[PDB]
Amino acid sequence: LAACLACAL
Amino acid sequence: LAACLACAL
Amino acid sequence: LAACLACAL
Amino acid sequence: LAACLACAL
């Protein structure tokens, strides 16, 4: 989940 | 954007 | 290890 | 890059 937030932004 | 980040975490 | 490879690329 | 992935695995 943390990585995907990161990815998004 | 900024606020979205703050929120998520 | 597997995840390290994934990430790098 | 494609070859080094291949190598790795």
- Write out the DSSP string of B1-9: -HHHHHHH-
CA–CA separation, D8 vs B5, rounded Å?
A: 35
Contact: chain D with chain B (3+ CB pairs below 8 Å): no
Method: X-ray
Cβ A6 vs Cβ B4: under 8 Å = no
CA–CA separation, A3 vs A9, rounded Å?
A: 10
Closest residue on chain A to B3 (Cα): A9
Listed in sequence order, the residues at least 6 apart from D9 whose beta carbon sits closer than 8 Å to its beta carbon are C5
